[PDB]
Design a protein around this ligand. Structure first.
Ligand SMILES: *[C@@H]1O[C@H](CO)[C@@H](O)[C@H](O)[C@H]1NC(C)=O
Lengths: 195, 211, 226
C-alpha cells in the first residue's frame, strides 16, 4: 500500500480556509520524495523535521490539511504568525512539527467574474485556537445592540468571499496549501516510509 | 567574518525614479542575503529575503536579485515614504554581518520655509535661563541660513541648530534654532529677531518680537 | 501577535554589567521554531549581532565571537523574557539594543535556514556614562493661516525623550527635532506642530513628554498667552 498523498495534492476541488479538509493518512507507506523533488510548489517549509530525513522516519498518524488562500496570506500558514487567516481561519501551533507546502492555482481556482466559491472569515470575537475550524455562520456584534439575526449597525456577517479573478495580482492569485502534520502516540506505527 | 560592502553610501532621486543599491560579499553567500529598511526612529523592517523573495506588506516597487558576491536591491518608482537607510545582511556564516547602509533621500521641488519665532516662557525666565526659538517648517533644499539679531546686533555663538529628516509625505525638511541667554542678559535688550535666507525665499525673511 | 518589547536601564556606569530584558508577547520563547537574537546599533553607525538564544537545558547559546568574553544570554519562560548581559561595559557599547525573532525551518533540500529577522522590537537606548541622571524641564512654545506651537524639553540626561501630542491623537505637522547636546553637558529637544489658526480655539494642545531613564513623564499645555 502507498499513502494517498496525491489524493490530497492532485485534487480537483480544494476547500476554503474556514473549512480546511483534514485527511488522515495511516496504514500505508509514504515516499515524501515525490513532494520534495517536485518544483511545482512555491512554498515548501518544514518546521521541526527535515524533509530529507522523513523517508527513514516512522509515525503513527499523518494529517493533511488542505485549503485555498491568497498569496500575500500564505505567510500566515506558519508558527507564530498573525493576521486575518492565522487569527480567524487557520492557526498552526507555535510548537509545530510538520510541513507547509503551497503552490499557485490561478489556472484552476480563478474565474472571469471571480471564484466566489472560496470564502474566508473576517470577524471573530476570539482568536482561533491551534488547529481550529470555525464553520459557523452566526452574525457578529461589535456594540451594545444585539443583532438577533441582522447585518447592519455594528452587526456583520462573519464570512466574506475571495474575489479570485485571473487578472488579479500575484498576491491575490489563489494559492493551494497543504499542511502535513505528524503524530507519535503509543500505538502501532502505521505511516512508515520506504525504509 | 564575511564583510558586506554596501554601495552607494547616499543616493538621491525623484518621485517615480528607480534606485539601485548593491551589496558585495567577502566570500560567496549562496543567495543568503536579506534587506532591511530602517526609517528615522524605527527598527530595521525586513523587505526581501532569499535575495529575491519579498516579505508580506512590502510594495511592488521593492525588488531584489543577486548571487555569490554581487547582490542588488531596486526600487522601481521611488515614492516619498521610501526615505530610509537600507541594510543587507548575510546568513551563510555565523555571525550574521550587516552592511554599512545607504541613505536614500528624495528630491523635491524647491519649497520656501515657514518661519516662526517663539519667545521664552516666563516659567523658564523664572528658572534663570531663557531660550528664544526660531522655526523653519517646510523647506527643500535642506540648505538654509538662520541668523539671530538682538537689538539689531548680528549675534552668533549661543545658537544651536537641529534639522529633522525628510518627511515621508512631502520630502520637506524642518529646522529649529535655539538661542539660549541668561535671564539678566535677556532683559538687557528688547528686539529679538530671526532672519532666514533660503533658495525659495527671494529675499531674507525676518520674524521679530519685543519684550 | 508576536510582540517584542525591550526594557532596561539607560545609564550604566562604565566597566559594569548590562542587564537587558526582551518581553515576548503573543508567542512562546520555548518554541523550537523561534530563534531570538540581540542586535545593537551604535548611534549613527551600522548594526552588530550580539548573539542568539534558541531552545532545542536545550538552550544552545550562540553568541558573536567578537563579544563572547562578556556576553551571557538567558531565557525565563515564567515571564516570557529573553535576557542579555554584557560586562566590562565601555563607552563603545553606547547603542540602541534590539530584540528580534527568526522563524527557522528546513528547506526542500534539508537546510536549517531562516527568512531573516521577522519581528523586531522598539529598542532600548543604553548610554554608558558616569554622569548622574537628570529629568527634563518642559516649557511651552506658545503661538503668537497655519500657526505654529510646540514644547521645549530642556536639560535632560541621558537620551532619549519621547514626545507625543494629545496622547497620540495629534500626528500631522508634528515635527520632533533631534536632540542637541548643550554646552552644559545636558541634552535639549524641541517638538513643534503647525495647526490652523482657527484650531487655537477649537482644540486644546498638550505635549506628552516621557523621559524613561529618570521616570519623568510630564504633560504641558501649550496655550496662546497675552
Ligand atoms: C501530481 O501531478 C502529476 C499528475 O499528472 C503526478 O504524476 C505527480 O506525481 C503529482 N505530484 C505530486 C502528488 O506531488
Amino acid at each position: 500500500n502507498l499513502c494517498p498523498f496525491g489524493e490530497v495534492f492532485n485534487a480537483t476541488r480544494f476547500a476554503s480556509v474556514y473549512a480546511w479538509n483534514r485527511k488522515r493518512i495511516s496504514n500505508c507507506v509514504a515516499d515524501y520524495s515525490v513532494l520534495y523533488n517536485s518544483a511545482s510548489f512555491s512554498t515548501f517549509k518544514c518546521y521541526g523535521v527535515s524533509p530529507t530525513k522523513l523517508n527513514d522516519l516512522c509515525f503513527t498518524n499523518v494529517y493533511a490539511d488542505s485549503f485555498v488562500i491568497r498569496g500575500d496570506e500564505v505567510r500566515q500558514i506558519a508558527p507564530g504568525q498573525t493576521g486575518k487567516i492565522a487569527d480567524y481561519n487557520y492557526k498552526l501551533p507555535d510548537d509545530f512539527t510538520g510541513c507547509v507546502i503551497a503552490w499557485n492555482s490561478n489556472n484552476l481556482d480563478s474565474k472571469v467574474g471571480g471564484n466566489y466559491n472560496y470564502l474566508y472569515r473576517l470577524f471573530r470575537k476570539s482568536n482561533l485556537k491551534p488547529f481550529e475550524r470555525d464553520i459557523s455562520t452566526e452574525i457578529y456584534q461589535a456594540g451594545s445592540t444585539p443583532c438577533n439575526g441582522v447585518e447592519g449597525f455594528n452587526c456583520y456577517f462573519p464570512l466574506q468571499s475571495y474575489g479570485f479573478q485571473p487578472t488579479n495580482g500575484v498576491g491575490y492569485q489563489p494559492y493551494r496549501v497543504v499542511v502535513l502534520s505528524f503524530e507519535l502516540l503509543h500505538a502501532p506505527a502505521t505511516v512508515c516510509g520506504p525504509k | 567574518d564575511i564583510q558586506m560592502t554596501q554601495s552607494p553610501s547616499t543616493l538621491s532621486a525623484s518621485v517615480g525614479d528607480s534606485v539601485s543599491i548593491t551589496c558585495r560579499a567577502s566570500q560567496s553567500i549562496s543567495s543568503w542575503l536579506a534587506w532591511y529598511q530602517q526609517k528615522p526612529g524605527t527598527a530595521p523592517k525586513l523587505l526581501i529575503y532569499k535575495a529575491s523573495s519579498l516579505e508580506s506588506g512590502v510594495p511592488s516597487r521593492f525588488s531584489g536579485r543577486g548571487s555569490g558576491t554581487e547582490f542588488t536591491l531596486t526600487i522601481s518608482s521611488l515614492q516619498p515614504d521610501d526615505f530610509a537607510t537600507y541594510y543587507c545582511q548575510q546568513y551563510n556564516t555565523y555571525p550574521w554581518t550587516f552592511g554599512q547602509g545607504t541613505k536614500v533621500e528624495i528630491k523635491r521641488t524647491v519649497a520656501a520655509p515657514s518661519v516662526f519665532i517663539f519667545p521664552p516662557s516666563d516659567e523658564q525666565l523664572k528658572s534663570g535661563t531663557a531660550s528664544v526659538v526660531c522655526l523653519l517648517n517646510n523647506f527643500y533644499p535642506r540648505e538654509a541660513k538662520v541668523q539671530w539679531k538682538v537689538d539689531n546686533a548680528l549675534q552668533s555663538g549661543n545658537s544651536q541648530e537641529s534639522v529633522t529628516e525628510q518627511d515621508s509625505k512631502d520630502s520637506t525638511y524642518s529646522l529649529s534654532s535655539t538661542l539660549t541667554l541668561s535671564k539678566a542678559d535677556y532683559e538687557k535688550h528688547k528686539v529679538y529677531a530671526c532672519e532666514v535666507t533660503h533658495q525659495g525665499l527671494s529675499s531674507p525673511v525676518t520674524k521679530s518680537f519685543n519684550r | 501577535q508576536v510582540q517584542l518589547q525591550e526594557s532596561g536601564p539607560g545609564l550604566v556606569k562604565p566597566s559594569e554589567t548590562l542587564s537587558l530584558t526582551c518581553t515576548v508577547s503573543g508567542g512562546s520563547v520555548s518554541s523550537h521554531n523561534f530563534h531570538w537574537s540581540w542586535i545593537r546599533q551604535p548611534p549613527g553607525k551600522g548594526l552588530e549581532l550580539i548573539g542568539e538564544i534558541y531552545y532545542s537545558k536545550s538552550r544552545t547559546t550562540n553568541y558573536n565571537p567578537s563579544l563572547k568574553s562578556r556576553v551571557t544570554m538567558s531565557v525565563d519562560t515564567s515571564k516570557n523574557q529573553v535576557s542579555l548581559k554584557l560586562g566590562s561595559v565601555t563607552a563603545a557599547d553606547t547603542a540602541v539594543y534590539y530584540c528580534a525573532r527568526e522563524l527557522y525551518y528546513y528547506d526542500r533540500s534539508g537546510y536549517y535556514v531562516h527568512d531573516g529577522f521577522d519581528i523586531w522590537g522598539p529598542g532600548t537606548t543604553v548610554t554608558v556614562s558616569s554622569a548622574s541622571t537628570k529629568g527634563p524641564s518642559v516649557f511651552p512654545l506658545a503661538p503668537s493661516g497655519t500657526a505654529a506651537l510646540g514644547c521645549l524639553v530642556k536639560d535632560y540626561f541621558p537620551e532619549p525623550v519621547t514626545v507625543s501630542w494629545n496622547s497620540g491623537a495629534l500626528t500631522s505637522g508634528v515635527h520632533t527635532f533631534p536632540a542637541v547636546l548643550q554646552s552644559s553637558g545636558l541634552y535639549s529637544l524641541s517638538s513643534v506642530v503647525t495647526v490652523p489658526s482657527s484650531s487655537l480655539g477649537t482644540q486644546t494642545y498638550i505635549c506628552n513628554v516621557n523621559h524613561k531613564p529618570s521616570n519623568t513623564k510630564v504633560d504641558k499645555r501649550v496655550e496662546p498667552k497675552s
